[model samples]
Target chain A: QDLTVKMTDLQTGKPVGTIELSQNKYGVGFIPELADLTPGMHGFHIHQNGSCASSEKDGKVVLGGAAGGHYDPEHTNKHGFPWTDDNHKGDLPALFVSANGLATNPVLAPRLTLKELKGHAIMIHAGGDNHSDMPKALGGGGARVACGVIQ
Target chain B: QDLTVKMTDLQTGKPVGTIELSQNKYGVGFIPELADLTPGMHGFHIHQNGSCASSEKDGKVVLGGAAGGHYDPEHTNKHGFPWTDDNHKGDLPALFVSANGLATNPVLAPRLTLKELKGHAIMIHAGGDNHSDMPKALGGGGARVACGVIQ
Candidate 1:
């Protein structure tokens, strides 16, 4: 099966780029070539809902909040390093954007399968991921910077 | 087959309600229970993109612009009455919102099918639609008030 997601910037609501995921021997290969992301490490995960639309709560704009929380069907609610036994199912390897604002790394999540990722949205958080619930909740990925729906 | 669309308020980025479109012998039944809209009629149509996320262009926020233009696969930009052969494929009946912002009308679009509607977004305009190309371009729907993706 071919699974490709087109990422869109939440703030401007424009097509930033795309990340294609294909099934591999071990698990899934995340081949990303995203552009326009802030340079540095950014939190990346699969969200529960398929929507990339923003929502307002308490008179504030919550971008991509409609995608709901991270894909935590297991209800673990715990955040740990990717591939760990206790991390949220949505947790994945962090994306590192270059100083020029381009991400081309190919990360892998052995624990994730294509079936579980279908009908979900991939979210790139504003902050980097420590893959833990330490300093802040969900690695303190403050805002949802970009999102893409997986079909 | 059937599809459920979760409508979200553009400004508030909050969920307004849901619209269920189920396939039937007659056509597709548009049963809606939308609650965040203003009382009266609003322009309704299916947009090109499946993402309802907003974007900024020219320093202005274009709500639901990511969904692209109306679902005009034939490249016919003309806006005609729903079910009419000359209109854009996305043109649909006006959604009537009650005084309490409740829309319970079960509309029927003879031209639409569930299969063609899959992977698209439904949008509600801030103003009413005349279903004509004259007075105002694209029925003068004004700002996109709410939108939901169909999968």
Candidate 2:
């Protein structure tokens, strides 16, 4: 599905960015005010094997990425940490939201299939996800701060 | 832009309604769960062409629909009343929630197009829109009771 979204910049009153996404082609993208972001590489990846739906599953906030296995289809042997090339499907390039609080890189991920995204939600955390389990692997991205689903 | 929506009945939590709409369609359909909805129909319509991107618009509660008017293409006629087919393009239909404040009707409109819905909002009144300017037809659907944009 292809969608065009309009959202408030939240901080700036300007109707700033636009995202274009299609299941088969491009996924959702954001261009937050770079001036408001911390300049750095931020871990970014589609979750593995889990439900992002708000509805309860067996009475829980079903975590996303619980189903995809970190997106590592190769089934690599290493599971040491997210940054260790454990090849966990959850590993993806870091997302960089510029210090200007605006996102300019325009990151794109084609590996994700539409089927996996069905009935799921996208989450943005306060901190960066490191993709490692130890010492906060998966970067110990702090609590979810913002979320939305693909329409 | 006809949309088929599946909603969970607010009271029973049962999925009981599905709405299909197109560009020409206006009003929404639903029966609130409240008690004794004043035995008449309320006025409804797609609000005008402006931005309600925030909770505050120019120091006021930048309410949606305050922007005004539906995207009426031809603009051949402008009927400002909601219930009158001659009213502004925003003139649509009124809804009545059940006495319990829950919605139960499964309504669909095939006339509205997606293009017309662009940059607009939907608002429901506490009273009714009498559809006439005489003493405010459609019962003035007093103050906006509930509102949401067309997703």
Which stretches of model 1 miss by more than 4 angstroms? B1-151
RMSD of each: 21.2, 21.0
Computed on C-alphas against the true complex, the DockQ of each candidate is: 0.01, 0.01
Model 1 agreement with the true structure over A1-151: per-residue lDDT tens digits: 7778899999998898999988754456677888998876678888999899987889998999999998887889888654455668788767767667887655556567887798899999899776778889998788999999998
Q: Model 1, DockQ value?
A: 0.01
Indicate the worst ten consecutive residues by lDDT in candidate 1 chain B.
B103-112
lDDT tens digits by residue: candidate 2, B1-151: 4544333222233443443443322233222233322332334455554443335446755334344444455463453432223446566534434334443222222224466565565554556544455585434655444444555
Q: Write the per-residue lDDT of candidate 1 for residues B1-151, one digit (tens) a residue.
A: 8778888998899998899997754356687888967876678998999989887889998999898888887788798655466768898767767557787655556567889998999999998676787699888888999999997
